[PDB]
Design a protein around this nucleic acid. Structure first.
Lengths: 129, 82, 213, 186, 149, 82
RNA sequence: UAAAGUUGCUGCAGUUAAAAAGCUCGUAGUUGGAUCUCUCUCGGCCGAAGCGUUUACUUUGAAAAAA
């Protein structure tokens, strides 16, 4: 069956971006998907998206600015400490100049740079560059 | 493409597909740069200006160059509605 | 057209399109041609939206006009149905015609005698003229094609939805493209009909004339 | 009629209550208004110069209050000229429990008393004569959210002017930007 | 896809967005509840009650009219079935298959199907015991199944 | 097609789609009032009814069960609701 | 030991090179859809002021031989 709806969302975005499409339909939606999309959008990787409100579970239409090289999930959500963040971001990111690791944190869902700014660790949700 | 001082250090700045915003590689010989002549509103004659659309070879290979160029022209007002 | 009153389609053009059977597509529809059709008839023929046809014709004319050397535009036709039309278009507009066999390597092999380096390519049928279309993908050559309902759109950048089967329709569309190109350049005006009637572009099929004569 | 839990009715609340009492004293719907009462009333500004009246109603009465909603709203609008009026049920929002929970907060929070459900019901009854047939949430590049509500097409005539009063009321008592459009075809 | 079959069918019901009572439905909540009670007194399961109310009385969804589900309503009134309806039908099917197997011992496909049905029974019973719908002492027996039906 | 507007599909396209694959799912069924020549009240019948619906004031049959939509009897006027 | 991404958690393979059980059921194991923003000492600024169901996680702070 379907576990990790965030994995499905990120893989659908990845495949739509590879196909060159300007919009992708993501279903089901969830809070974690919305926060991940907001993290991706604050860095200009996707652009505005819309939540279609069914009465069962969300749908999302994400507009796709052709900037996303790759958005992926890390399963399982390994717990990550601050001292171990550099190793994760050296394994997952193409450069030290761009690309973000998303972590769920007691302070919210946010990228690794802002996690460093808040001096906090968490669980790795995924990455995008 | 910038360094700490601020000078640009790239050898050049490659074009991007007008339909996908992906970089058109220097060896993408299937990619095109269509030039679409602009027209005076009253006379309907070539006024010397043009709109330029760069399409990568990947889009032309999948058959989407037609619709992509049509959308680009429609957004620019060259192609009317309906 | 650009929502311009001067560039809008006029009645006489519509009557010419209907007489030539331009709006008559085919039984099959390409999935990339669905945006250019209107509806399927009861006999299984797709009707081609003539407004979109005019829009694509004017877009192709705008593409052709933005080529400073007229000879840099190459007009191809392998089927004899569009050969005379291509020759007349080249004579009227200054384009370079390739009527008949297209030798492979004409664009990619610089040793050949017929080697040429067009800046724009206009073909009659993408299916029949597939070789120039495939070679235009080696030399950064954008392409304009007169595509039917079933015509593939690979390597076709501006497709003009039209009947490219009947001689009347293809001749008429080459005539219209020439007329629009000349009008857009400045030669010949838009306030008087072109002195050339489209019949100068039609494939004759000499048997019909000889039996008629 | 008015019965605040803080036992401090105001000039506007007392005026609304006395208008309702008068409507009891001469109308054709006196029988239903006998049991019905209200909790509070507020005057807000929707935008420009126009204003809106928000009548908060006890939840069990709300459905009954919605039976005579259109007539009573028309009467109150007549008594108040160009002031649009809307009936909102007075629903309480229990805060989301944290590791701070006391004897009263021992009982689990009902879902109907969550913020999401309360705001959804507020939006539902804010447009009461028209039914919500769709909802979208647009997230802008700055992270702000805009709700677009799709109301029933057959009831567009008597609610289109109420748009931008619905939005003002919602932004007042809820805090989220909302737009009220109509679907192209249901 | 299906738990005990290779098929992956999409067929199901599609509830509409609107959760309000349809305008054609003049029946009140108590009227629908009395209809439910009368149908239940006939020995009809909640699925049959919902089908009958949908096909004859215009009740699109009992939950959106009465604010409650059919099984919940019957439990509140106190005349709900002892064991849940789906488990009852699974046990009924298993009893039918065992009765068939009593006279057809070469029906190996029937034996395979009985194994599948009993597995479904055990999964459902374990779920119901987890939720305390069934007593923890409840056990489905291959020799005394026809007493629960 | 690339730039296919997934937020506002055509109503024809949404009617073409499977009821569950629609942007917001909606049933393909409806409730319809049947009026009989010899009755004083209107009976609500599900378009895909599974039960044999008898006349609300007689023994006349209204609809027959079927693999899909219920088959109405001939002689009773059915009008769709909403 | 690295080279060995020829033990592969990172990070390998299983159509034909070595390889998916003949096929199903099935317990343990593993993995599982959306959803929920006072202070029973009170004294004319100070303290008896609460792991406040809990845990995992994360960030602290103690304590933790030397070499």
């Amino acid at each position: 069956v379907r576990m990790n709806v965030l994995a499905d969302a990120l893989k659908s975005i990845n495949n739509a971006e590879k196909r060159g499409k300007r919009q992708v339909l993501i279903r089901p939606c969830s809070k974690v998907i919305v926060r991940f999309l907001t993290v991706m959008m604050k860095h200009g990787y996707i652009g505005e998206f819309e939540i279609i409100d069914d009465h069962r579970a969300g749908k999302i239409v994400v507009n796709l600015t052709g900037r996303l090289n790759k958005c992926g999930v890390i399963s399982p959500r390994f717990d990550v400490q601050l001292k171990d963040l550099e190793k994760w971001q050296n394994n997952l990111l193409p450069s030290r100049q761009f690309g973000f690791i998303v972590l769920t944190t007691s302070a919210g869902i946010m990228d690794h740079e802002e996690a460093r700014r808040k001096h906090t660790g968490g669980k790795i949700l995924g990455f995008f560059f | 493409m910038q360094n700490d001082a601020g000078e640009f250090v790239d050898l050049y700045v490659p074009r991007k597909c007008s339909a996908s915003n992906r970089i058109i590689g220097a060896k993408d010989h299937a990619s095109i740069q269509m030039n679409v002549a602009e027209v005076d509103k009253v006379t309907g004659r070539f006024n010397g200006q043009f709109k330029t659309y760069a399409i990568c070879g990947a889009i032309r290979r999948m058959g989407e160059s037609d619709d992509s160029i049509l959308r680009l022209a429609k957004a620019d007002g060259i192609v009317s509605k309906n | 057209s650009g929502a311009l009153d001067v560039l809008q389609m006029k009645e006489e053009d519509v009557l010419k399109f209907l007489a030539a059977g331009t709006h008559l597509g085919g039984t099959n529809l390409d999935f990339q041609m669905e945006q250019y059709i209107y509806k399927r008839k009861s006999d299984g023929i797709y009707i081609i939206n003539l407004k979109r046809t005019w829009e694509k014709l004017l877009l192709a004319a705008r593409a052709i006009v933005a080529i400073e050397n007229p000879a840099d535009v190459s007009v191809i036709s392998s089927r004899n149905t569009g050969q005379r039309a291509v020759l007349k278009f080249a004579a009227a507009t200054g384009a370079t015609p390739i009527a008949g066999r297209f030798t492979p390597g004409t664009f990619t092999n610089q040793i050949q005698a017929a080697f040429r380096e067009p800046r724009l390519l206009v073909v009659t049928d993408p299916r029949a003229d597939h070789q120039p279309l495939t070679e235009a993908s080696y030399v950064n050559l954008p392409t304009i094609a007169l595509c039917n309902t079933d015509s593939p759109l690979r390597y076709v950048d501006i497709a003009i939805p039209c009947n490219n089967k009947g001689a009347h329709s293809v001749g008429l569309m080459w005539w219209m493209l020439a007329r629009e190109v000349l009008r857009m350049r400045g030669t010949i005006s838009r306030e008087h009909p072109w002195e050339v009637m489209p019949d100068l572009y039609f494939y004759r099929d000499p048997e019909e004339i000889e039996k008629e004569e | 009629i008015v019965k605040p839990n803080g036992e401090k009715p105001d000039e506007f609340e007392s005026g609304i209550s006395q208008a309702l009492l008068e409507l009891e004293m001469n109308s054709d719907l006196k029988a239903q208004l006998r049991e019905l009462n209200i909790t509070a009333a507020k005057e807000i500004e929707v935008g420009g110069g126009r204003k809106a009246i928000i009548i908060f109603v006890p939840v069990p009465q709300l459905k009954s209050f919605q039976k005579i909603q259109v007539r009573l709203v028309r009467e109150l609008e007549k008594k108040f000229s160009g002031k649009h009026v809307v009936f909102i049920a007075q629903r309480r929002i229990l805060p989301k429990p944290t590791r701070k929970s006391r004897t009263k907060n021992k009982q689990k929070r009902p879902r109907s008393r969550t913020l999401t459900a309360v705001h959804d019901a507020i939006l539902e009854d804010l447009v009461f004569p028209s039914e919500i047939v769709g909802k979208r949430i647009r997230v802008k590049l700055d992270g702000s959210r805009l709700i677009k509500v799709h109301l029933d097409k057959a009831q567009q005539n008597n609610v289109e002017h109420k748009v931008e009063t619905f939005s003002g009321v919602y932004k007042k008592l809820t805090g989220k930007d909302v737009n009220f459009e109509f679907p192209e075809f249901q | 896809g299906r738990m005990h079959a290779p098929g992956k069918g999409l067929s199901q019901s599609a509830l509409p967005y609107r959760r309000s009572v349809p305008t054609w439905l003049k029946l009140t909540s108590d009227d629908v509840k009395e209809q439910i009670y009368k149908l239940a007194k006939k020995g009809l399961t909640p699925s049959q009650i919902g089908v009958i109310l949908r096909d004859s009385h215009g009740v699109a969804q009992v939950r959106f009219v009465t604010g409650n589900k059919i099984l919940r309503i019957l439990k509140s009134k106190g005349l709900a079935p002892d064991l849940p309806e789906d488990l009852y039908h699974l046990i009924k099917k298993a009893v039918a298959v065992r009765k068939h197997l009593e006279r057809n011992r070469k029906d190996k496909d029937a034996k395979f199907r009985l194994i599948l049905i009993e597995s479904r029974i055990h999964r459902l019973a374990r779920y119901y015991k987890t939720k305390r719908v069934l007593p923890p002492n409840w056990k489905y027996e291959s020799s005394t199944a026809s007493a629960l039906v | 097609p690339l730039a296919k507007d997934l937020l506002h599909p055509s109503p024809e396209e949404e009617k073409r789609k499977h009821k569950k694959k629609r942007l917001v799912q909606s049933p393909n069924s409806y409730f319809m009032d049947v009026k009989c020549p010899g009755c004083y009240k209107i009976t609500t019948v599900f378009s895909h009814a599974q039960t044999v619906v008898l006349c609300v004031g007689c023994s006349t049959v209204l609809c027959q069960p079927t693999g899909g939509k219920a088959r109405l009897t001939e002689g009773c006027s059915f009008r769709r609701k909403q």
